[PDB]
Scaffold this active site. Structure first.
Site, PDB file in Angstrom:
ATOM      1  CG  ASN A 162      43.656  47.242  48.413  1.00 13.16           C
ATOM      2  OD1 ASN A 162      43.174  48.364  47.640  1.00 13.16           O
ATOM      3  ND2 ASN A 162      43.995  47.578  49.681  1.00 13.16           N
ATOM      4  CG  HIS A 208      45.367  53.868  50.663  1.00 13.59           C
ATOM      5  ND1 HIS A 208      45.688  52.389  50.068  1.00 13.59           N
ATOM      6  CD2 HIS A 208      46.339  54.469  50.038  1.00 13.59           C
ATOM      7  CE1 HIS A 208      46.762  52.374  49.600  1.00 13.59           C
ATOM      8  NE2 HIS A 208      47.325  53.624  49.496  1.00 13.59           N
ATOM      9  CG  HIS A 227      45.079  57.121  46.280  1.00 17.68           C
ATOM     10  ND1 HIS A 227      44.536  56.959  45.139  1.00 17.68           N
ATOM     11  CD2 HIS A 227      45.930  56.372  46.684  1.00 17.68           C
ATOM     12  CE1 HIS A 227      45.334  56.122  44.712  1.00 17.68           C
ATOM     13  NE2 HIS A 227      46.239  55.414  45.557  1.00 17.68           N
ATOM     14  CG  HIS A 284      52.059  55.390  50.964  1.00 22.57           C
ATOM     15  ND1 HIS A 284      51.093  55.079  52.052  1.00 22.57           N
ATOM     16  CD2 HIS A 284      51.656  54.871  49.818  1.00 22.57           C
ATOM     17  CE1 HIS A 284      50.172  54.584  51.519  1.00 22.57           C
ATOM     18  NE2 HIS A 284      50.341  54.559  50.054  1.00 22.57           N
TER      19      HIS A 284
HETATM   20  C1  LIG Z   1      41.504  47.601  44.630  1.00 24.10           C
HETATM   21  O1  LIG Z   1      42.039  47.646  43.118  1.00 24.10           O
HETATM   22  C2  LIG Z   1      43.113  48.403  43.222  1.00 24.10           C
HETATM   23  C3  LIG Z   1      43.879  48.943  44.344  1.00 24.10           C
HETATM   24  C4  LIG Z   1      45.049  49.794  43.829  1.00 24.10           C
HETATM   25  C5  LIG Z   1      45.300  50.290  42.594  1.00 24.10           C
HETATM   26  C6  LIG Z   1      46.557  50.703  42.580  1.00 24.10           C
HETATM   27  N1  LIG Z   1      46.999  50.964  41.312  1.00 24.10           N
HETATM   28  O2  LIG Z   1      48.099  51.584  41.215  1.00 24.10           O
HETATM   29  C7  LIG Z   1      48.070  52.379  42.509  1.00 24.10           C
HETATM   30  C8  LIG Z   1      47.600  53.862  42.016  1.00 24.10           C
HETATM   31  C9  LIG Z   1      48.901  54.632  41.082  1.00 24.10           C
HETATM   32  O3  LIG Z   1      49.814  54.795  41.624  1.00 24.10           O
HETATM   33  N2  LIG Z   1      48.628  55.154  40.204  1.00 24.10           N
HETATM   34  C10 LIG Z   1      46.956  55.193  39.411  1.00 24.10           C
HETATM   35  C11 LIG Z   1      46.256  56.268  40.076  1.00 24.10           C
HETATM   36  O4  LIG Z   1      46.355  56.308  41.297  1.00 24.10           O
HETATM   37  C12 LIG Z   1      49.642  55.760  39.344  1.00 24.10           C
HETATM   38  C13 LIG Z   1      50.119  57.093  39.833  1.00 24.10           C
HETATM   39  O5  LIG Z   1      50.187  58.282  39.097  1.00 24.10           O
HETATM   40  C14 LIG Z   1      47.407  51.664  43.451  1.00 24.10           C
HETATM   41  C15 LIG Z   1      44.722  49.601  41.609  1.00 24.10           C
HETATM   42  C16 LIG Z   1      43.606  48.667  41.914  1.00 24.10           C
HETATM   43  O6  LIG Z   1      42.551  48.305  40.943  1.00 24.10           O
HETATM   44  C17 LIG Z   1      42.813  49.139  39.795  1.00 24.10           C
HETATM   45  C18 LIG Z   1      41.355  49.217  39.269  1.00 24.10           C
HETATM   46  C19 LIG Z   1      41.361  48.729  37.822  1.00 24.10           C
HETATM   47  C20 LIG Z   1      42.650  47.571  37.865  1.00 24.10           C
HETATM   48  C21 LIG Z   1      43.626  48.545  38.628  1.00 24.10           C
HETATM   49 MG   LIG Z   2      50.887  56.507  46.116  1.00 26.66          MG
HETATM   50 ZN   LIG Z   3      49.224  54.188  48.438  1.00 27.95          ZN
END
Ligand SMILES: COc1ccc(C2=NO[C@@H](CC(=O)N(CCO)CCO)C2)cc1OC1CCCC1
Ligand SMILES: [Mg+2]
Ligand SMILES: [Zn+2]
Ligand SMILES: COc1ccc(C2=NO[C@@H](CC(=O)N(CCO)CCO)C2)cc1OC1CCCC1
Ligand SMILES: [Mg+2]
Ligand SMILES: [Mg+2]
Ligand SMILES: [Mg+2]
Ligand SMILES: [Zn+2]
Lengths: 324, 322
Positions: free
Chosen positions: B232, B75, B71, B111
């Site tokens: 991604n 990104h 992040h 964002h």
């Molecule tokens: C290239 O792979 C990914 C690229 C982006 C994500 C996201 N997952 O959700 C968003 C992040 C989020 O909003 N979170 C999680 C903490 O940032 C919650 C906020 O509190 C972006 C996940 C990805 O893979 C993860 C690795 C294991 C499977 C999931």
């Molecule tokens: Mg976000």
């Molecule tokens: Zn984002």
């Protein structure tokens, strides 16, 4: 003394909170909260040290503004005390857990803390730091919550120190849900849903409401505190008149800041073109009575006298307005 | 410059944003944003002084943390550029106003600004000042907005200074609506509503979407930027591989913080017990493919190649499960 005698009306609608404010040296929130915590045995049930409770309450009360005419510590004490009475309504007897009761009363106590005496829309339109922080959404209500919780961090101010982690987490969620529901922009949605709840309500043979999920349970506590927040016109006319004086003073001061800035003056905020009587009648007709009528429906006949007072006060305010 | 040659792909899916980051001295967000604003003629339309734009972009970019693996400003640049490409999809030709276009791009840029590299739930669980400020609700997303808007107040940073008052109000509202929709807790509801729009889709002869009101337009913008945020796995595999390495590094650091505090380690945050490939496949199956398949339906057939790449990338990670 006289204060202990006035506090004997703490379980009654129409406690003279202005007297209690004067007699307590401007500590109505502290004494009424303390009295209610003792009454409901809350200090023992949750292991709250009494010195801790009082330190927090005094700090909380200190963060209500003395120069804000309506949204001050007297309003907070009034909403706390009104919620306290509503909690004891027969239709709700043995319905809520002690934690839920604690959440409703705590939410009432903090629900307007550090109020600046201007509206959410004012803060948004003047590009305030508060509206920037909160992205124009429930700006004040989010802030009340943050301040209310943040004060728990003061020395000897953590009244929840002896709750379990689970209890703390549940209480925090309920308090947030309740205070956010005091945002007037959510009023019509809360009311529409409360109407639907009344339409489909379940009881028990004993006669009390059946609320068997969090969504129904929090919905009742939200509207209950919302009703207590909007309970001024349901009070004895001598109390209501004083609340009306204060809200108009606060509105007119906002209107004067708007006029100074060359802004359009918000409805009811222009001291030169405002009818107090017309505004109270409209407030009752379009907001307060439609809500209390629905609450009275939910807990029938528990709120009949409250609804009668409201209707008598409405008839009193409209009586000096010329009508065809 | 070699930079100029790479920026020729700014209108293509799979621009090599990591190459842009290196070639630009780790200013991918500033250069890509500048390129897009020039291309879309947004400086002229909104009378944005170019020096004010660059100053705001450099300031904004400085508030993405260099020590956060995923992040960060790359990104942000990626999501801005992906949004830029999605806006140009044929099914949306002449659909959005320049102000709506500006809002989508600006929202994408800010964002995730000042992301600390841990989740909302981690901030709530550890009683952070931020979760306290925002009452546990869309904690980071509220913060990203506050910061992105606050930075406009820095010296020579107000890129919206020459919008009218009503334009500023409209753009502020759209940007908030869009960034709050990047909260993953809203994904299921956002997707459900997107499915509903697909079901009641109105288009012209040439298949251009007919959006009737603010509700229609903001919903499409919200889903577009959400798609860009989750784009991604739809990118050329070499890009996707690097994004996967970065998100795992960030997740693992959060897990390390959890383990150290004796907390339950969050899903996919335990470096000692991770299945990186299997988690990417689950991510695609349960989140990314359902979302993009629905978007693809909305703009059919504009996104067919993106969907094909997603399905190929899923099989790659499938094939590398140990
Ligand atoms: C290239 O792979 C990914 C690229 C982006 C994500 C996201 N997952 O959700 C968003 C992040 C989020 O909003 N979170 C999680 C903490 O940032 C919650 C906020 O509190 C972006 C996940 C990805 O893979 C993860 C690795 C294991 C499977 C999931
Ligand atoms: Mg976000
Ligand atoms: Zn984002
Ligand atoms: C005793 O009379 C009143 C007692 C309470 C109210 C309230 N009305 O709205 C609540 C505050 C609120 O949430 N606002 C208004 C800004 O404070 C919304 C934006 O923040 C409290 C109004 C009352 O009457 C007013 C005087 C003329 C009619 C209206
Ligand atoms: Mg309030
Ligand atoms: Mg090329
Ligand atoms: Mg439509
Ligand atoms: Zn209030």
């Amino acid at each position: 003394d006289v204060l202990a005698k006035e506090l004997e009306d703490v379980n009654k609608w129409g406690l003279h909170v202005f007297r209690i404010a004067e007699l307590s040296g401007n500590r109505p929130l502290t004494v009424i909260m303390h009295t209610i915590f003792q009454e409901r045995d809350l200090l023992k049930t949750f292991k709250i040290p009494v010195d801790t409770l009082i330190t927090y309450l005094m700090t909380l009360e200190d963060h209500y503004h003395a120069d804000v005419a309506y949204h001050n510590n007297i309003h907070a004490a009034d909403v706390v005390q009104s919620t306290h009475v509503l909690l004891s309504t027969p239709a709700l007897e043995a319905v809520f857990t002690d934690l839920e009761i604690l959440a409703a009363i705590f939410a009432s106590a903090i629900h307007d803390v550090d109020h600046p005496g201007v509206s959410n829309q004012f803060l948004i339109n003047t590009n305030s730091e508060l509206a920037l922080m909160y992205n124009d959404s429930s700006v004040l209500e989010n802030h009340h919550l943050a301040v209310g919780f943040k004060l728990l961090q003061e020395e000897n101010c953590d009244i929840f120190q002896n709750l379990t982690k689970k209890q703390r987490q549940s209480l925090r969620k309920m308090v947030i849900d309740i205070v956010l529901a005091t945002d007037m922009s959510k009023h019509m949605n809360l009311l529409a849903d409360l109407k639907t709840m009344v339409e489909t309500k379940k009881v028990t043979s004993s006669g009390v409401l059946l609320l068997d999920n969090y969504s129904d349970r929090i919905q009742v506590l939200q509207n209950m505190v919302h009703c207590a927040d909007l309970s001024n016109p349901t009070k004895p006319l001598q109390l209501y008149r004083q609340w009306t004086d204060r809200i108009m003073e606060e509105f007119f001061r906002q209107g004067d800041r708007e006029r100074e800035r060359g802004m359009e003056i918000s409805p009811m905020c222009d001291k030169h073109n405002a009818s107090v009587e017309k505004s109270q009648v409209g407030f009752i007709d379009y907001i307060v009575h439609p809500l209390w009528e629905t609450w009275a429906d939910l807990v029938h006949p528990d709120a009949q006298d409250i609804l009668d007072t409201l209707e008598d006060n409405r008839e009193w305010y409209q009586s000096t307005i010329p009508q065809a």
